[PDB]
Ligand binder design. Sequence first.
Ligand SMILES: O=c1ccn([C@@H]2O[C@H](COP(=O)(O)O)[C@@H](O)[C@H]2O)c(=O)[nH]1
Ligand SMILES: O=c1ccn([C@@H]2O[C@H](COP(=O)(O)O)[C@@H](O)[C@H]2O)c(=O)[nH]1
Ligand SMILES: O=c1ccn([C@@H]2O[C@H](COP(=O)(O)O)[C@@H](O)[C@H]2O)c(=O)[nH]1
Ligand SMILES: O=c1ccn([C@@H]2O[C@H](COP(=O)(O)O)[C@@H](O)[C@H]2O)c(=O)[nH]1
Ligand SMILES: O=c1ccn([C@@H]2O[C@H](COP(=O)(O)O)[C@@H](O)[C@H]2O)c(=O)[nH]1
Ligand SMILES: O=c1ccn([C@@H]2O[C@H](COP(=O)(O)O)[C@@H](O)[C@H]2O)c(=O)[nH]1
Lengths: 234, 238, 238, 234, 234, 238
Amino acid sequence: AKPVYKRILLKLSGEALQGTEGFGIDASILDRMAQEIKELVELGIQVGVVIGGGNLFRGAGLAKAGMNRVVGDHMGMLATVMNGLAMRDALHRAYVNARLMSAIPLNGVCDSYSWAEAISLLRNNRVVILSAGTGNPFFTTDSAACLRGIEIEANVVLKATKVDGVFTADPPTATMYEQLTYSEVLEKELKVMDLAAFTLARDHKLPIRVFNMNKPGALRRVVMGEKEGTLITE
Amino acid sequence: TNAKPVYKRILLKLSGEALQGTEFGIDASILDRMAQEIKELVELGIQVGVVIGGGNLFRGAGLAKAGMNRVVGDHMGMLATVMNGLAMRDALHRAYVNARLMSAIPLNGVCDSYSWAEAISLLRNNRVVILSAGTGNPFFTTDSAACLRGIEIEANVVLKATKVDGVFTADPAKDPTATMYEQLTYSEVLEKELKVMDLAAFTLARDHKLPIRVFNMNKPGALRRVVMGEKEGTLITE
Amino acid sequence: TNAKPVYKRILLKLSGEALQGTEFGIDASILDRMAQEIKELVELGIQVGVVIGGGNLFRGAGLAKAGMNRVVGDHMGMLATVMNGLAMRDALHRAYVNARLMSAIPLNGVCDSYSWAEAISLLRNNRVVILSAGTGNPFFTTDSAACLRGIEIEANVVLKATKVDGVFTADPAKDPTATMYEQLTYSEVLEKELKVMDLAAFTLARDHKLPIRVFNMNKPGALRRVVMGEKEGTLITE
Amino acid sequence: AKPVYKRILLKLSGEALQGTEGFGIDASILDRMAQEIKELVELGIQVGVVIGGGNLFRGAGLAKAGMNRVVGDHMGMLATVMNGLAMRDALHRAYVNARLMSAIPLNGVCDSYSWAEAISLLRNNRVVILSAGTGNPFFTTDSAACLRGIEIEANVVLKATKVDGVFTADPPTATMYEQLTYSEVLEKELKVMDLAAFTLARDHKLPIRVFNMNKPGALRRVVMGEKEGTLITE
Amino acid sequence: AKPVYKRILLKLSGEALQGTEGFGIDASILDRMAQEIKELVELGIQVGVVIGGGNLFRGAGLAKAGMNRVVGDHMGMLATVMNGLAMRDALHRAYVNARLMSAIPLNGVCDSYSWAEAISLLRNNRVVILSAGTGNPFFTTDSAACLRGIEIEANVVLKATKVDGVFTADPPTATMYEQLTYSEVLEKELKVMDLAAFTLARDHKLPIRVFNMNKPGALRRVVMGEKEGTLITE
Amino acid sequence: TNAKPVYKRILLKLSGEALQGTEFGIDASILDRMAQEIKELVELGIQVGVVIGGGNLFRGAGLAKAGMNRVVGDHMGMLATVMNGLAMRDALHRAYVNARLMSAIPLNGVCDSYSWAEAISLLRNNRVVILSAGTGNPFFTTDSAACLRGIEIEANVVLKATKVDGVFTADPAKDPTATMYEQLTYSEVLEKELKVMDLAAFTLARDHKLPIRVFNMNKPGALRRVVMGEKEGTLITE
Ligand SMILES: O=c1ccn([C@@H]2O[C@H](COP(=O)(O)O)[C@@H](O)[C@H]2O)c(=O)[nH]1
Ligand SMILES: O=c1ccn([C@@H]2O[C@H](COP(=O)(O)O)[C@@H](O)[C@H]2O)c(=O)[nH]1
Ligand SMILES: O=c1ccn([C@@H]2O[C@H](COP(=O)(O)O)[C@@H](O)[C@H]2O)c(=O)[nH]1
Ligand SMILES: O=c1ccn([C@@H]2O[C@H](COP(=O)(O)O)[C@@H](O)[C@H]2O)c(=O)[nH]1
Ligand SMILES: O=c1ccn([C@@H]2O[C@H](COP(=O)(O)O)[C@@H](O)[C@H]2O)c(=O)[nH]1
Ligand SMILES: O=c1ccn([C@@H]2O[C@H](COP(=O)(O)O)[C@@H](O)[C@H]2O)c(=O)[nH]1
């Protein structure tokens, strides 16, 4: 029983790093993720990680309050660097080789995203954390996850949510799909990331796997080709 | 009326805490009000350098206790100040106030990299200069950056904006015996072991005779009072 | 005469193709003419942001088919836009037009690194701002950058300068049935599956109600016609 | 029969990468060069590569058309980065470790030229591609080839041209020299790169070898000390 | 007899690199230091080096002459980069893997200080040279030595002076202490670096060892836990 | 009186040696005087670009003989020019002269990164532009940078400021037969094998017809004499 993927693009939503308070970053979750990612690295799986920032700031949210949307999005991107920073540290303290890259240059703190460098790091079994998403306002980290996934030629984009997967509707009667095609998602107007991102993933045939990052072992199951979450291909 | 400001150039240190205003994150309404108060100083001809905190988001020390490497915790803290500096600058722009955001740690694209020469030139041109990422080094606080930058830009005084009317004998929101002084010397702040800033900062401010006035920025118009020379906060001189 | 421009700020997207003008490379005479036309807009008080293409030199997709890694192909394409931006800026300077070249990917020394705050400040100061390297990311086109930057700088409209009078029903130089519309809605450009820009861009322009006018830049004075509100090209609105 | 050089500075003229049309970049040529350079790397030869840009833009040429010479030269230098980019990729797809450096910082795309880094890469058998020449206008990549050659202490500068070597005149009667001294080149006013470059190579005793990059195996022959092209020393 | 420290922060004062003239940099001293540091690296000791600049420029000194103190300090910091440059080279010519980092970004010349990178280099037995001190005016390299020492979690800060150690007064009757506590230093107003630095080292319990860098083998003795110089702890 | 400068834009190359003035390091009083002389040129409407040497601190070649790798020696030399550029800029600021320090090798924070477009814009705005780190490449001297930058900014002339009245037949402080010419052609400087600059530089200046005037900057007012067209130093033209 060997893993089913060689290189993956793990997308961690920012809310996944929140404690009970539903804000900031929660050490315990980060520490557990480091252990789960550690296991994948040992399993020979190359891991690229795109991290969210919504647990701190959402540009759109700041804009409604009156702020210029672009500055709000810059803050949001910065927030992802903060999460990337905390995640990288959790990885290092777990003795996992990891490099934090940023689409927005932040000398000293981490390194600027570099495709060539990124590929070289992955081939050398370094966990590469991609922060600041796409580097542009008006986008989400989901778009960065798909863009970076395509860029590093990941076998799949693993979207870690707080739910088991894709449901017929936000789960009383709602059931969970095990597999879907981009066509069926759109057709039924199912909820799987932002349209710009999904569309991007579709046009490039980047398969997506929606799974629950709170269910311990879920991540491992997904890479081991075991029944877990929903697969989106076609 | 007829009165004129007592300072020509100041280093205003906006504490992160004071940017919270209930519920963490940033309180838009507070930022919007500060932009109006700073706007008034600019119009009054006062050159303003602003060092902003980040404790309303992250404190390295706090993150370290949770297990994180202290240096990475401080880097996050410094980044948090850039986030506040970003929000503050925007509030300034939307209030039609010319402002630049400089960062101790280069984050090119989102804001300027701190530059002393540039900073002086901007201040002389009546641009509000926001200094973020504090000193750029871990193991320090923005209070140290406020004193360092204040000395660097040759500010006439460092105005520490906080949530308390001044320098108390103990945290007023936790100790009912809390009492604040209206005047203190660098010395008295050493014998009375009073809290103003981390000794590292204070000492720097002392050796260079940089006066410090602590006031509450939650008090609308308090900053203006300070600048006009009216009874507000705690003055700390030699 | 008596007429005034209908736009105060525009995002002009100069397609690489239109910079070819026979024989690949860049056609000096075309650049020189564009500088004169843009010069006129600046004098008319119109703030101009320019997103320039690179397909007259390299197209990532094209390089990929030849065997190159798509990402490196797109990086070359983006660099190609910087080359055009460089030539265009120079044409602007030699025409005595204040202009800045910003690049999505920092190439410090040769040109400025794109900065939103800086860009707005330059536009307000009547500086022509040239945006190169498009969005800075592979898998996108400059058309996406034109829409993104247009939204970013709050342009009143995106003017797509091409080699055809407007949005045809098919490539006019290859299909004799080719016909262009004078008006279309984001919707009609979806039902009629008409070609304007990559859906990625268009969609962005739609969600933000950024109007788009496609015109031929090979037509001397066509840009001026657009800006003055005269019949030219294809207008795409909501 | 082992190679005769340990570290070399390979100078590829921009026109060498042009297809039949005599413009842009031709995949096939790049792909073949990657194979030839691959062989040198395996032979233990450390390779530094200075690439031209004249197959895209020549500052002087742009200036005559009316452009400011400095901007024309900046475009020319950028053109070399484009070639460096394509060449590096050809190297990677041929499974050859290679790093593209630039005298003009281009964050993300490639790395900024760094002498220390360059030496370290060469010692680690990484092909180092130097683009943007000297970084200054009013110079040619030939000057960069000599400057970088001296900098990395290359044993020789291999100037790859479309000709077998140095002739008595641009080859009907013209014959090819097998060896020359800097003195004889100047004396007879022979055509071997720009004066600024040649002079630089002379003052530092940087030997030069002019050879035909279109003649398959020529490069290998030159490094194997076999009769090929012209040698310039003294 | 194995060494007593694993990672150290070696602080070289700028005057230690001066020749007889008492100015500039003296090759011979640099060459000897490279040999002594080489030995530590081979002994498995991870070495971080903070270098001074007072052998070239002191901001305070330039200020008295009329210059703006900040610009004077920038020159002073630059001076440390010059020493760092010369020291790194001495290390490379002695075949010691070394990287020069700077708190003030100096593209091409060396690398910008990076904590993560620094730790990674030390773990890989690379001598890391930290120049431009803290990067801020109004500080000394002694403060940088303590700050960087704490940052890289060095076991001790070795302050190399022109004296055997800490004396009761600048050595006729003055005697040398073998061990002191931060409290006794302050209490007796003993001379051990700047207050800002010492205080910093104290608050973090960073032990300090003052020793003579001119006494050949002194450095080795200190790392071998042999009687040498003064220890400052508590 | 009634006289006007003969140059509109010059490239002033301040040799490191001339910054020594007894005892190595920099002589504050010399820097202060130069600031006053340059101040006068700026007021006279003359645009000034300044390329500064570093030999008063480090010479790569010199360091190499001692055993250091030549490239690292040259990097130190270039850094030395940044140190002089820093001191010179400050002397200019304290003399109330608008000045920018640009460096061939980016040292962001302490000074601007050299930028041709920026440089021209600064000169046109009467800012003294100081160019440090010479050409940015090892194996060259600041004399080459002076000629290169001079050509780049289209200076009317390169003024080589040294410690000798002009171009002598041999080092005047070591050879008593030393004699200087008042006029020379690029050719004569080749047949007479006279010393002005490294052939690499000179040749560049020749091919572009960049005139060169060598004068002593230890002579108070000599720079002004040159600019006013009065007998001073050695003129080297075609
Ligand atoms: O490429 C990107 C990615 C994210 N964001 C901003 O950063 C936040 C990151 O949070 P999220 O993607 O986790 O929701 C977003 O809300 C948004 O404001 C962008 O502007 N661009
Ligand atoms: O020079 C500085 C300034 C701030 N900080 C960090 O960033 C936070 C900024 O918030 P504050 O407590 O200064 O408001 C601090 O808690 C600290 O962790 C530093 O590391 N260095
Ligand atoms: O955001 C962008 C913009 C452009 N390009 C690349 O650069 C070329 C720019 O030319 P154009 O086709 O947009 O004119 C494209 O073909 C493409 O390969 C990108 O990778 N990303
Ligand atoms: O250091 C250099 C090297 C090249 N170039 C420019 O870039 C082009 C590169 O092409 P070439 O050297 O292959 O002819 C030149 O024509 C020239 O315009 C420079 O300005 N400086
Ligand atoms: O963080 C630092 C370290 C040093 N210096 C300056 O650089 C010189 C370095 O020499 P020293 O620390 O060896 O005395 C100091 O004199 C001072 O002017 C600073 O401004 N900040
Ligand atoms: O383009 C340049 C300019 C200067 N230098 C170095 O820096 C020193 C600058 O001093 P100078 O002799 O030009 O005054 C030179 O000795 C040399 O080692 C270079 O490497 N390249």
